[PDB]
Amino acid sequence: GRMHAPGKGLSQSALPYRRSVPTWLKLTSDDVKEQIYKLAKKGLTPSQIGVILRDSHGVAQVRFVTGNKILRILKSKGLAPDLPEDLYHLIKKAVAVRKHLERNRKDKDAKFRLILIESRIHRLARYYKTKRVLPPNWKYESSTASALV
Amino acid sequence: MQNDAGEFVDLYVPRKCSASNRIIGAKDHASIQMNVAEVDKVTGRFNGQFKTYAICGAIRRMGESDDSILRLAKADGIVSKNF
Amino acid sequence: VRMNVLADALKSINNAEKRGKRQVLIRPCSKVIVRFLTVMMKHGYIGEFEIIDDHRAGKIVVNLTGRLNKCGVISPRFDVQLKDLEKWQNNLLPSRQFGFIVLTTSAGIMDHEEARRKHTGGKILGFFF
Amino acid sequence: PLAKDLLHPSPEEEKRKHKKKRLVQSPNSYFMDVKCPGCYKITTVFSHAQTVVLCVGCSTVLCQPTGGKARLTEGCSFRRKQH
Amino acid sequence: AKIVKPNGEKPDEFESGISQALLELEMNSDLKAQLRELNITAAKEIEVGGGRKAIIIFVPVPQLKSFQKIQVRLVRELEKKFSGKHVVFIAQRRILPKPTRKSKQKRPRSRTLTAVHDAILEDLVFPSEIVGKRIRVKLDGSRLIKVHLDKAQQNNVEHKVETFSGVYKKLTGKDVNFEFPEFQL
RNA sequence: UUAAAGUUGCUGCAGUUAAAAAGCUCGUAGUUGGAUCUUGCUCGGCGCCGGCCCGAAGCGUUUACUUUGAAAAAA
RNA sequence: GAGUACACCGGAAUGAUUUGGGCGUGCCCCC
């Protein structure tokens, strides 16, 4: 099941078996790479780019059409942020919980969820330090709210 | 059961089930010596031919054996393939 | 979570053998499952079987036959010597006149009977009888 | 039943089961092809729209995000789009 | 005149005749925009298991898509010049050996044996792509593959399944059967 | 003191009611981890007229595992 | 050239003639 919640769940995407670009789609490679470049210049996370292209462009899967994924493209052009977007969202959630919790001293479940979020970001930071994406001297401090976002 | 000298020194062999290929013990009283008859090709009358089937007791008491009878008859050819 | 696909698959086919089913469905796939069931296939315990290969880990559908008592697997993969093979099959197989135990030879996945005449041994997989 | 044909089942139990528990995985979604009644440009929209979508020319919205499928605006016609 | 080779040798007279046949079949028709840089590598005559014959055409990898646009006219013209023989298109790929203990950069998985066989089976049949695969393990242990094909474009490929079976038997050595499912598609 | 003791359970014990699962959760060590990849390059030997093969000085990516040998005091 | 129905041109089918549109390739507009 989940890593913190006790409830099991089964809700995820299921890709089709056929590895083929559909005939009715006419965006071959260069134009669709141009909208990924423009939408990355707009400043969105790669999941947002994928859902926007799938929503309003009729593309089935980028990896079925373009030879690599979204983050490979953004690292090839070098405009991707250094901080990964899931860890960035988790840091945003942690600083939001702290920004709720400096005033309500009697709250306890918020403190419990804060402890769970710190555990999750420590595990993700350990994985990213193992995979050398982040520098090995980097770590999380509880007081760095404006230094890192 | 054969020995090295080449004799059937086993005293008897018991029957095997026709639906699950399981063995039938001597004290399992829930077995059937099923007999089904055929018909003549030109008149549909009795001829004298038998096709014996055997069903073990767990297949009866477990809940389904009639479907196994259908599979045995379609393999034999009594029940037609369209069903 | 799932840590041994062979143990789960073999427990599933054992449960369906006890349940009297004719065909099964193994959810994961590997090489060692294919070699283990083809050792059983060449030994005549199991007849036809099938593999459903998608672009992920495939599924295996086995056409069973009522000649099987129980199939077992030993975890963890213990070390077996040539002088320890008879010590294992004395207290693992129900008899010395039948029953087979397989092991990871450096030359293929194969049972103990041919391993006695090829003068070799390795890590263990399981037994069937 | 003890004996079932798992090699090739009937399609109605294939669409009856979950999309992950089938013999081969197949998603239960596809792509619309609607035309706005205001501006007569035809676009392609996913089954689950997940956000607001605008036709080209920026005249009238086409789909609204719901829990499930797309909330199709009245006056838009789609058809069976397959590859 | 057009056929290049990775190593230095003179091509056979049959492949040269095929090259001149495609050269005259491109100069007579109006197709000039996409057979300038487009080239083949080699051609081999394969005797299918019957009274017929089959041929295969070697295509270099990085220009595969431009051939992949225009099969439906070219195979019709190559059948118009000779109707007693079928024409298929495949791409040559080199199969690197395994990095065993006695052994050189890291081998990518685009050139491994499973990927080459998968690409050969996929490019053997253009107008109906695969939708499923089944592998039969019969009584003697030898595997044979059943391939599920698309329902659309079924009329022109119904009589070519023996040709595909012969080509895949000659190329790899594994028996492959073909069928058309209808319920799931 | 050993076997009987499957009453110390690695093979090979038990944990609802007979003795028994921390009140719950997070978390560093330790334990267990999905599928997928089928040998060649400077010396001279068995033979033939500067040459083919054979033997190579020297190199020919890491562990566990298994098999063959040596060395392994006597009673 | 607006693409819901339109005004055309060239290749090609029958020396001369030539066929309602649409982009969702299969059903949608006007008869």
Curated annotation (Swiss-Prot), chain A:
GO molecular function: small ribosomal subunit rRNA binding; structural constituent of ribosome
GO CC terms of this entry: cytosolic ribosome; cytosolic small ribosomal subunit; nucleolus
Domain of life the protein comes from: Eukaryota
Keywords annotated in UniProt: Acetylation, Cytoplasm, Isopeptide bond, Nucleus, Phosphoprotein, Ribonucleoprotein, Ribosomal protein, Ubl conjugation
Keyword Lipoprotein on entry: no
The keyword Oxidoreductase is assigned to this record: no
Annotated positions of the Phosphotyrosine modification: 37
Modified residues (N6-succinyllysine): 26, 33
Signal sequence extent: none
Subunit structure: Component of the small ribosomal subunit. Part of the small subunit (SSU) processome, composed of more than 70 proteins and the RNA chaperone small nucleolar RNA (snoRNA) U3.
Task performed by this protein: Component of the small ribosomal subunit. The ribosome is a large ribonucleoprotein complex responsible for the synthesis of proteins in the cell. Part of the small subunit (SSU) processome, first precursor of the small eukaryotic ribosomal subunit. During the assembly of the SSU processome in the nucleolus, many ribosome biogenesis factors, an RNA chaperone and ribosomal proteins associate with the nascent pre-rRNA and work in concert to generate RNA folding, modifications, rearrangements and cleavage as well as targeted degradation of pre-ribosomal RNA by the RNA exosome.
Name of the protein in its database record: Small ribosomal subunit protein uS15
Classification of source organism: Eukaryota, Metazoa, Chordata, Craniata, Vertebrata
UniProtKB/Swiss-Prot annotation, chain B:
Entry's Gene Ontology molecular function annotations: structural constituent of ribosome
Primary localization class, coarse: cytoplasm
One of the GO biological process terms: translation
GO cellular component: cytosolic ribosome; ribonucleoprotein complex; rough endoplasmic reticulum
Modification N-acetylmethionine, positions: 1
InterPro entries named in the record: Ribosomal_eS21, Ribosomal_eS21_CS, Ribosomal_eS21_sf
Subcellular location: Cytoplasm, Cytosol; Cytoplasm; Rough endoplasmic reticulum
Cross-link (Glycyl lysine isopeptide (Lys-Gly) (interchain with G-Cter in SUMO2)): 41
Annotated transmembrane regions: none
Keywords assigned: Acetylation, Cytoplasm, Endoplasmic reticulum, Isopeptide bond, Ribonucleoprotein, Ribosomal protein, Ubl conjugation
Similarity section: Belongs to the eukaryotic ribosomal protein eS21 family.
Entry function: Component of the small ribosomal subunit. The ribosome is a large ribonucleoprotein complex responsible for the synthesis of proteins in the cell.
Matching PANTHER family: 40S RIBOSOMAL PROTEIN S21
SUBUNIT field: Component of the 40S small ribosomal subunit.
The name this protein goes by in its record: Small ribosomal subunit protein eS21
Organism whose genome encodes this protein: Oryctolagus cuniculus
Taxonomic classification: Eukaryota, Metazoa, Chordata, Craniata, Vertebrata
From Swiss-Prot, chain C:
GO biological process, one term: translation
Residues carrying N6-succinyllysine: 87
Xref: Pfam families: Ribosomal_S8
Molecular-function GO terms, alphabetical: structural constituent of ribosome
GO (cellular component) term, any one: cytosolic ribosome
Swiss-Prot/TrEMBL keywords: Cytoplasm, Nucleus, Ribonucleoprotein, Ribosomal protein
InterPro entries: Ribosomal_uS8, Ribosomal_uS8_CS, Ribosomal_uS8_sf
Cellular localization per UniProt: Cytoplasm; Nucleus, Nucleolus
Gene3D superfamilies linked to this entry: 3.30.1370.30, 3.30.1490.10
Signal peptide extent: none
PANTHER family with a match to the protein in the record: 40S RIBOSOMAL PROTEIN S15A
Subunit description: Component of the 40S ribosomal subunit. Part of the small subunit (SSU) processome, composed of more than 70 proteins and the RNA chaperone small nucleolar RNA (snoRNA) U3.
Family: Belongs to the universal ribosomal protein uS8 family.
Function: Component of the small ribosomal subunit. Part of the small subunit (SSU) processome, first precursor of the small eukaryotic ribosomal subunit. During the assembly of the SSU processome in the nucleolus, many ribosome biogenesis factors, an RNA chaperone and ribosomal proteins associate with the nascent pre-rRNA and work in concert to generate RNA folding, modifications, rearrangements and cleavage as well as targeted degradation of pre-ribosomal RNA by the RNA exosome. Required for proper erythropoiesis.
Protein name from the UniProt record: Small ribosomal subunit protein uS8
Curated annotation (Swiss-Prot), chain D:
Biased composition annotated in UniProt, kind: Basic and acidic residues: 1-15
Gene3D superfamilies: Zn-binding ribosomal proteins
Biological process, per Gene Ontology: ribosomal small subunit biogenesis; rRNA processing; translation
Annotated binding of Zn(2+), by residue: 36, 39, 55, 58
Location in or out of the cell: Cytoplasm; Nucleus, Nucleolus
GO-annotated cellular components: cytosolic ribosome; cytosolic small ribosomal subunit; nucleolus; postsynaptic density; small-subunit processome
Record PROSITE patterns: RIBOSOMAL_S27E
KW tRNA processing (keyword) present: no
Function: Component of the small ribosomal subunit. The ribosome is a large ribonucleoprotein complex responsible for the synthesis of proteins in the cell. Required for proper rRNA processing and maturation of 18S rRNAs. Part of the small subunit (SSU) processome, first precursor of the small eukaryotic ribosomal subunit.
Protein name: Small ribosomal subunit protein eS27
Organism per entry: Oryctolagus cuniculus
